[PDB]
Amino acid sequence: TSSIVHLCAISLDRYWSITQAIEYNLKRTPRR
């Protein structure tokens, strides 16, 4: 039970950072 979460806690983070940088620039606006 606890051996999962943790894990899950890894595989997610990885994508966390990414996401955070995406949206960043995603629909942005841009503006533009």
UniProtKB/Swiss-Prot annotation:
Cytoplasmic compartment residues: 13-32
Domain of life, per lineage: Eukaryota
UniProt subcellular location: Cell membrane
Disease tied to this protein: Lipodystrophy, familial partial, 8: An autosomal dominant form of partial lipodystrophy, a disorder characterized by abnormal subcutaneous fat distribution. FPLD8 patients show selective loss of subcutaneous adipose tissue from the limbs, beginning around 13 to 15 years of age, and abnormal accumulation of subcutaneous adipose tissue in the dorsal neck and face, as well as in the posterior thoracic and abdominal regions. The disorder is associated with metabolic abnormalities, including diabetes mellitus and hyperlipidemia.
Role summary: Alpha-2 adrenergic receptors mediate the catecholamine-induced inhibition of adenylate cyclase through the action of G proteins. The rank order of potency for agonists of this receptor is oxymetazoline > clonidine > epinephrine > norepinephrine > phenylephrine > dopamine > p-synephrine > p-tyramine > serotonin = p-octopamine. For antagonists, the rank order is yohimbine > phentolamine = mianserine > chlorpromazine = spiperone = prazosin > propanolol > alprenolol = pindolol.
Family: Belongs to the G-protein coupled receptor 1 family. Adrenergic receptor subfamily. ADRA2A sub-subfamily.
Protein name, UniProt field: Alpha-2A adrenergic receptor
Protein species of origin: Homo sapiens (Human)
Residues of the whole record sequence present: 133 to 164 of 465
